[PDB]
Design a protein around this ligand. Structure first.
Ligand code: LMN
Ligand code: LMN
Ligand code: LMN
Ligand code: LMN
Lengths: 404, 404
């Protein structure tokens, strides 16, 4: 049955992705115990995390490019097995260089997880049910990250820090075999079906670069606000050290809610509306959320004094999180849906690369501008850039959409 | 006349490239005066240099890829004009963010200089005279860098720091028009001649990846030695603070001599020997210099005690510089010569990217290994890697050379 097969594939995917993220964050989970056992300074942890991040970025781009030439099931299982083996080996090392070398292969293996999931979802689900399940897998990753630390410390205070990593690796290996056994690549491999534009022609379309610039701006603004909102609130507004934590929590909760709601409403709008070679039914929600993000930025910058109630700050944070985390999922869904049946990964790898460079831009120059002039000037610059981007995106709404 | 036209093109190229490098390094040349005028801390200078370096790397790759679709003369002149304009605008600014934003466009413009020169050299010169002139252009860059500082401080102590940059920009604009007028793209544009493998077929050849890995190892080892030789000599050998400076000077001089000699001897060997689809006449010198580099590394690591004469240290530094700076030029020449008549830039951009990642590897993990274990262990690791690479390169000598 279609429902039975979809349920089985979805359950296996959910479990695999949750284990992926747990084993990504296990070192940060268990850091205090190994710090107590073998002392480390602040440089070693940063070096290890930096190596993992660089490996993750490079692998992610490469596996996104290559995911259209190899089977999704084998890619998923191999990545999970390598992640488990790397964790098991990490459990039996006691020197920084070996730690940092083992945490690089971890990023390389982690880069292989999502593109197979995206391809299987696209080939198994109808285009009117392809933003809901995307967001639900994102929430699977969120749930794994949220439930990680509590169980991690609960288990670590009981036995040790070395046993937890080995147990996680063994569980990853077992679940890798289970997912290999359970996941099906295509409906044709069972007896159903739910249904050429070379790379040179794909790269010669303007929609790809429009989406890349949109992702640039959205990710950069989100990173700027997430990284420096507490700093702005503490050093210029005059608030305490708990209002920042509450504002971050509200931002995260509102962002999760906004991602799910954006996916569902966009899928409903696409199902309701028709299809044509020009335009996209998913653009209205994207433009609305962009405008909401800009308005919330302006309100937070201007109408938050030293005597503002805490409820107002929480409301502003929630609204910005909603309107900033919706469009990210929308771009991720669109860059893969509005592509030929092949080259889906190659239509998303470039977008991820733009996200990385936008993160670097949100990191260094924003901080130096804030240090020199002020935080108000830096946030004003970010808001002006976002408003200009939104205006350009609205001006370029009805364009050649289907690339190829 | 062939000689007259070659002389004119060579002179214009030499002048253009020398001005390119002078305007690359002018800020480092004139830094003390502007530091005295407007105080700066150590973070701002690093930020500016980092922005320029990142822009240079990205532009270099992009312009190497794109240099086969646009005219070399126009690319050269446009790059020089933009460099001059950027310097002129930099002369009229007084704040760090604007400085760092203007020093990014400088890197973007600088990335456009060399690939047009390489294409013109390949299309104008015979393959038996294409390693000598390559090395001579490299020495043009070296001469510009060497004669920069003296003239820079001599002029800066006279008038100001603001006038020097404007004068350099104006000179760059004038020389840009002169080079636009003088450089000829092809011999067919005058009435002579001195004489399809798509990118997908080009990327499916093993010679490209062999060359990429060789450049990886050579550049990484050279960067390791250049960066940490003084540290090793001072903190483990027990030598003074002037022996390191002498060792660096000997390394640089020996490297320049080795680059010129390697180019000349390799061109002579290729002219003497025949041509075939398998192998390359330029491999013997490359293997010999690789072996010399490994032997010199071992001798410097082992046979240099706290009582070694300074002449021995100078000799070892000169030999390593020779044997390390030869192969870099050899790889640069080969990756462009042993390529189809098109895609020459695309056959060198990947090699440059590998050089960048090898530089990062030589930078961070080598330093952390040296900090944890010792400098001797780090240099032993580098020497072992170089020896293994040399053995693999010798084992893979006679292979499919002409890619396509
Ligand atoms: C084989 C590949 C051949 C070509 C490679 C290209 C260039 C080679 C290296 C370039 C590159 C990978 C290449 C990107 C994709 C390549 C795809 C293009 C294919 C071309 C066909 C690594 O290179 C940089 O990586 C930095 C690590 O951040 C290092 O900083 C070190 O750590 C610093 C502490 O922050 C200190 O300053 C110091 O400790 C070091 O300085 C740099 O020294 C290093 O140069 C840049 O990638 C970028 O990815 C992203 C996400 O990871 C990173 O963003 C952030 O990283 C972490 C915070 O750092 C966060 O955790 C992460 O959340 C965040 O997102 C970037 O930072 C950067 O990593
Ligand atoms: C089919 C449906 C699927 C089910 C999904 C539902 C479950 C999702 C909730 C999980 C959730 C919400 C918590 C509110 C719950 C109420 C919400 C109402 C609805 C749910 C009922 C818990 O998130 C927090 O949970 C806390 C408790 O563990 C942790 O505190 C710890 O406690 C200490 C030890 O006690 C520790 O020592 C200490 O380290 C912590 O202080 C926090 O670290 C964690 O952020 C969010 O988690 C997820 O959000 C994302 C945001 O992007 C976050 O990713 C971030 O991305 C970057 C930013 O873009 C950041 O740069 C990056 O850093 C980060 O990776 C993560 O946070 C992720 O995990
Ligand atoms: C639109 C492009 C879309 C994709 C971009 C890819 C990823 C985006 C950013 C990745 C990338 C450019 C991309 C490489 C080529 C891309 C071609 C691939 C095309 C794919 C189809 C910049 O990204 C890094 O650049 C570093 C600058 O070094 C920054 O470090 C900052 O500064 C630090 C102080 O050293 C501090 O830690 C701190 O102040 C910051 O942390 C990092 O924060 C930053 O992440 C990494 O490139 C690399 O190039 C080389 C040579 O320049 C650099 O090596 C060195 O740099 C200087 C010493 O640094 C030296 O002067 C230079 O002599 C030396 O060689 C590398 O360092 C790196 O720059
Ligand atoms: C058709 C033929 C063409 C003619 C070519 C011949 C001319 C070439 C000679 C120029 C030469 C040799 C000097 C010995 C001369 C005898 C040699 C015998 C033959 C010649 C007769 C002078 O080189 C030095 O000259 C000194 C005097 O200016 C400078 O000291 C300054 O003084 C203070 C102010 O007084 C200043 O305040 C202070 O900053 C300095 O201390 C040094 O900065 C400079 O290095 C070498 O220059 C060139 O070498 C390359 C090496 O790769 C170097 O590039 C490096 O690459 C990276 C490393 O891979 C490095 O990381 C990177 O940092 C660097 O970019 C540069 O050095 C480059 O410029």
């Amino acid at each position: 049955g279609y429902g039975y097969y979809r349920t089985v594939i979805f359950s296996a995917m959910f479990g695999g992705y949750s284990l992926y993220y747990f084993n990504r964050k296990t070192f940060s989970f268990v850091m205090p115990s190994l710090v107590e056992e073998i002392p480390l300074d602040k440089d070693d942890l940063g070096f290890i995390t930096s190596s993992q991040s660089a490996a993750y970025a490079i692998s992610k781009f490469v596996s996104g490019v290559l995911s259209d030439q190899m089977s999704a099931r084998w890619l998923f299982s191999s990545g999970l097995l390598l992640v488990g083996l790397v964790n098991i080996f990490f459990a039996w090392s006691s020197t920084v260089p070996v730690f940092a070398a083992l945490w690089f292969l971890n990023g390389l293996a982690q880069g292989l997880g999502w593109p197979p999931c995206g391809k299987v979802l696209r080939k198994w689900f109808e285009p009117s049910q392809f933003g809901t399940w995307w967001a639900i897998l994102s929430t699977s990753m969120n749930l794994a990250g949220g439930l990680g630390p509590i169980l991690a410390t609960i288990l670590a205070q009981s036995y040790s820090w070395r046993s937890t990593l080995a147990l996680s690796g063994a569980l990853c290996v077992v679940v890798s075999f289970l997912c290999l056994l359970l996941i099906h690549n295509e409906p044709a491999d069972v007896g159903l079906r739910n249904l050429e534009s070379t790379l040179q022609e794909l790269l010669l379309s303007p929609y790809l670069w429009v989406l890349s610039t949109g992702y640039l701006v959205v990710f950069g603004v989100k990173t700027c606000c997430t990284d420096w909102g507490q700093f702005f609130l503490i050093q210029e507004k005059g608030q305490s050290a708990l209002v920042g934590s509450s504002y971050m929590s509200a931002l995260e909760v509102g962002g999760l809610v906004g991602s799910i709601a954006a996916g569902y409403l966009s899928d409903r709008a696409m199902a309701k509306a028709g299809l044509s070679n020009y335009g996209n039914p998913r653009h209205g929600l994207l433009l609305f959320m962009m405008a909401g993000m800009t308005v919330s930025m302006y309100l937070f910058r201007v109408t938050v004094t030293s005597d503002s109630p805490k409820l107002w700050i929480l409301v502003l944070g929630a609204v910005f999180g909603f309107s900033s985390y919706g469009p990210i999922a929308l771009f991720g869904v669109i860059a893969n849906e509005s592509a030929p049946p092949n080259l889906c990964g190659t239509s998303h790898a470039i977008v991820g690369l733009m996200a990385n460079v936008g993160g670097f831009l949100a990191g260094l120059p924003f901080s130096t501008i804030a240090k020199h002039y002020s935080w108000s000037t830096a946030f004003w610059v970010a808001e002006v850039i976002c408003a200009a981007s939104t205006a350009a995106f609205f001006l370029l709404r009805n364009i050649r959409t289907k690339m190829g």
